[PDB]
Write a protein that binds this ligand. Sequence first.
Ligand SMILES: [Mg+2]
Ligand SMILES: [Mg+2]
Lengths: 574, 564
Amino acid sequence: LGKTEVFLNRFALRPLNPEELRPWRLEVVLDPPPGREEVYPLLAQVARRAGGVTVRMGDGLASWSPPEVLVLEGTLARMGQTYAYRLYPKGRRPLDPKDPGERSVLSALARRLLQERLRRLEGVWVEGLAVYRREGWRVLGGAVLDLWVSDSGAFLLEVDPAYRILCLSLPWEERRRRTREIASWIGRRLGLGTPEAVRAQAYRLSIPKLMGRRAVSKPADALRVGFYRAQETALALLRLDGAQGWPEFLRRALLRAFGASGASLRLHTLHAHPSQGLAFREALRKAKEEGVQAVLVLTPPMAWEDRNRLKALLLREGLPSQILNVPLREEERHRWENALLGLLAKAGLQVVALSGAYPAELAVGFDAGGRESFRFGGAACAVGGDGGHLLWTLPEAQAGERIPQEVVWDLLEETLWAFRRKAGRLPSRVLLLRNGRVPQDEFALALEALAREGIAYDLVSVRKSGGGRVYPVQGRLADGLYVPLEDKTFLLLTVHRDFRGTPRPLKLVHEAGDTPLEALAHQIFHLTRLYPASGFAFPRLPAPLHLADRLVKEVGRLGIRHLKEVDREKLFFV
Amino acid sequence: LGKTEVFLNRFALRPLNPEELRPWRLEVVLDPPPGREEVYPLLAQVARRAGGVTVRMGDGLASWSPPEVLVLEGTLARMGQTYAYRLYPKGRRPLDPKDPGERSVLSALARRLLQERLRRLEGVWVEGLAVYRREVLGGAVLDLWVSDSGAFLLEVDPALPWEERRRRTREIASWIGRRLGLGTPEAVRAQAYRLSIPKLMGRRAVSKPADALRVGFYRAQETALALLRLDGAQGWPEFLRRALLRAFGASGASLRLHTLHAHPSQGLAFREALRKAKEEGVQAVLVLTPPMAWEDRNRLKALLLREGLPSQILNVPLREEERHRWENALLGLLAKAGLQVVALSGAYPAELAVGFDAGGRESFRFGGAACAVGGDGGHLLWTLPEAQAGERIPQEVVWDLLEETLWAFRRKAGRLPSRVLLLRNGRVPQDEFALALEALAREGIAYDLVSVRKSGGGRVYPVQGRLADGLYVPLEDKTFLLLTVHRDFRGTPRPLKLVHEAGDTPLEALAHQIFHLTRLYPASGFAFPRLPAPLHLADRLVKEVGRLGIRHLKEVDREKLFFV
DNA sequence: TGAGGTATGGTTGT
DNA sequence: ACAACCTACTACCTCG
DNA sequence: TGAGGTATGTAGGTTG
DNA sequence: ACAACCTACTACCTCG
Ligand SMILES: [Mg+2]
Ligand SMILES: [Mg+2]
């Protein structure tokens, strides 16, 4: 617990001058007139050809450059069709930084000023908003930049160091220094004053409590102390390498885990090979009939297509599988212990759970996956307060990133129904998580149905980009940092390792609900530690979202047609 | 068989003159030169703007008009952008109607000639290839192509009792032929074969599937059905209860009828009652409701489905004398509960038949399969569809769906089928079945691939007497028409057009099994579908999944025909 | 939703 | 473009 | 396919 | 357009 302070990778520069607060307003006339759907990009294009610092404002243009130095008359080309533009100055409109509407226009002007000013910088490498400065192959050093306006009417610089390959992670502290050096170097050159780094109040969240059969510090420990909830299991081994039976150290480790858990284990061997064709599927069917819940596949590294085909084939017989490549030595403990954890999660075992109290006893994550011209919208959930159960539900095919209102609700209803099957009652409050942005009204129906059903809720948008960066004012950088920014918007540093590079905090937006922000940050931060198939490192995303992202990715890869007979408690996609 | 003869709605006109056989070739020069996506359509626009009777041929142009009366130099506004074209005549090339490529060009020229010559008729109503001759207005749709014996061929279809349509077809054929200077049209005859009448079975022989309600079902098992009333009324209407009871008495199977005392208006508590019902054994639900809006219907269906309960809707008000409607609803209910209402009796080359279709009307589709297992079609099954970008079903998807129907046969019969009949709705895209075809060969399963096109088959009229269904008309090698269904009061029939894509089963045997398969469909009591049951089921499967979503089907048995 | 076929904006492929 | 298929809704009439 | 995040560079998408 | 998110593969290092 505790208040503390951090720097963001943003820097206050000079106040907008009186001039800039009243940008020049210009109307645009185009011949011929564009259709209703094509005009906005066209206005933007006009904004560029006019030159100087000019952006679209409403249906027209705003410029910080007087109209005499703009190119008021000229020509454009879009989708084959050629247009002729003329810009008529129409006085200047006083823009106030408080009216977030106006500020947005000022920030657009600010970015254009920055990009533009940077193009005129001598002996430096500029690409859009990137600048490279420090070294027939070469390493280039620099930063990605941004410029907007604070509501008190001053320039804000976001700076983040970056490299350029022309022919790579940075310790956090180094990145912080280079961030400052580059912020001043550019502010002094740009003519925007001396940069002063922005501070924010940060709060240190309580360390979450992870439980196997007993307390653990990492999920891999459940292999020695026992699982959070063990039950009678049967696992099968499929060897693609022509070898023996179970490697003894794998056997001994599984037996040890189950003995500590107080549950019984049956180990099977599949004496079949997929090159047998349909006979192979018969063996699977039999294996399944005999109780096998998941399969460990020992194989030389497989090509993606073979891997996918194999997974899909077992899946079609209701058998999740965990691959572990050979050659395999006993000393490669991390790899094979992670494999083992994978197998157990795919068998429907609860390896770890959290201890502690949280606002919501059901947490659900929503994502969309697939790289083709259609996506899958899907959900994964953590049931009970402890996250005592991890489930997935069948995805749905959709046109794009938006998940249809009815689909969101249906998925949600399945997870609620899972809670009701597992606890005998409805949850009093649910935590709804969305990977990335929530499209307008996407959750409207669902939200209404929960209300109707007497279930309290919170909606939280979780963005993996856009949060910027956070550095301690003093001391070492630790994860579990909560940084409230504006109202209902906050950063959350969930994971950090000194060797990984510099952390990227999540950016969260509280979209609906009245749970205090700090509480949401507490439960989400804690949720990152629930993921069972990573032994030694916690995911950045809370387990519902991490699982959901993996779910839609695997379904995107294998297809949805194989999942009919796969239990929703078996996490086949880890 | 009995051999016989039919007219097609095609008419032989004059042989191509020695001049039409050596069309002029022209080279096209465009400025600027187009990217890959714009060149073929751009040549087509140039073909039209040159005028006369000109078409794309290869990378250039062919005209039956000399270059001197074409607009050899001009411009093309395309996507508002702009190309300048010049055509350079490069002598003529002889074309021969026997090559099928060089011929494809002659037919293209023929269609253009037809369309062009029709525009220049006065005072009739022309729309592309359609003309309307007095009376709204009445007329015909026309086509022109080239036969391999190198003669023009006219398709004419008024745009009716079949006899009327035939008459009008003849009238319009001659009226057009002389007027267009193509000579006197003489209608084409084709040898047609009369297929054996399929033998449908319930508990015993039936002529229609609805008869299984009186004589008993092909295979009955102990069933439980539930009733959901959205109308605020009683219990089971008595006539429905008697009819069901009667059907199961005849079948020798026991029936248990339940009532759901829940309303969907109770939200989740309603889902609980569903779950409870399903545990107790309910297999399907009959829903008595006032007519529902599409969304409410979809939502309701999907909700029951999510608890693994297929549903049959029957609208109130309902009167006992509306026997067709409610008997059909009853047949639906039973198919959705997994009963085999009817099966065929006979010997077919393939003891597994599988249909493939794609559905959905959005930017993506669902590729799905439905099957008839056993030589009698003793089982009808669906498989979980897959999301895909367009009409093409991916090779691996085709094979996976197929493997599930094989596996259904293996679970039912305890062995692999000796030969399968693979049916594709619409055309088969290039190598769509290649992987599946190879897999079957590696498993020692014999196969046939048949493309089934609902349009393109044209029309068939008897030379003499009344028109009856189950007409097989071979055309070229491997292609054939199949008249599967007809009634007088529906209008003139539309033969299916079928292409034997892979396999060595004789065409007549394919036609036999396919024709017979049209009678297997259990949910239509009084009228057989045009498509054979595996394709009809499959078409309906991808339609319903395109409507509800695929997310509801995980707990729904693949023997329960929820989409009928 | 009762069912059937006959009537009147999209995908493949060159 | 365009050839040749297709999607899915509608109304009509009648009940293999 | 061992797992995580952090990095570049692909090659590029959806929402509004 | 473009702003601001995102998809999914890759290599690196190390093992809460
Ligand atoms: Mg994995
Ligand atoms: Mg029905």
